Amino acid sequence: KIQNFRVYYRDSRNSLWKGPAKLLWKGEGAVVIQDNSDIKVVPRRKAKIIRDYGK
Amino acid sequence: KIQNFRVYYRDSRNSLWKGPAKLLWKGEGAVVIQDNSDIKVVPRRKAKIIRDYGK
């Protein structure tokens, strides 16, 4: 969509940021994302939801 | 919600119907649900979204 949100996220195996992933849904303390076709569920604290704030 | 949507689903752990689960989100050919605190992602074909027809 136009908001063009991008999600950077953490996995439990590596203390590394992965992404940009597509934002599918937020709620119940989690963020549902999509990365390389895989649908993932990440806790809110492990997701950075980025947007272009300029336009 | 008076419709009282609940989800019956099939997962990869065991070959049968589980639920009722809470419906969190639908899209990208999947259904995001919550059951016994666990947030799960199930393909649409493996989810039965049920509602009250009597009341």
Side-chain angles (χ1 to χ4, degrees), chain A residues 1 4 11 17 19-21 24 26 31-32 34-37 45 48:
Chain A
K1 79 174 106 85
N4 193 42
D11 47 290
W17 290 105
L24 295 177
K26 269 180 70 195
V31 178
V32 179
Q34 190 184 34
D35 195 13
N36 306 322
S37 297
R45 69 180 261 250
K48 266 202 249 205

Side-chain angles (χ1 to χ4, degrees), chain B residues 10-15 18 46:
Chain B
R10 291 199 202 171
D11 65 30
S12 290
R13 227 243 176 91
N14 42 289
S15 190
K18 290 180 188 69
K46 287 189 173 171

Side-chain angles (χ1 to χ4, degrees), chain A residues 16-34:
Chain A
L16 260 79
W17 290 105
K18 290 181 174 289
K22 174 170 185 180
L23 172 61
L24 295 177
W25 179 85
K26 269 180 70 195
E28 203 49 46
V31 178
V32 179
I33 60 175
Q34 190 184 34

Side-chain angles (χ1 to χ4, degrees), chain A residues 24-25 28 30 32 34 39 41, chain B residues 24-25 28 30 32 34 39 41:
Chain A
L24 295 177
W25 179 85
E28 203 49 46
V32 179
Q34 190 184 34
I39 299 156
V41 184
Chain B
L24 294 178
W25 180 85
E28 201 46 38
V32 178
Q34 190 184 34
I39 299 156
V41 183

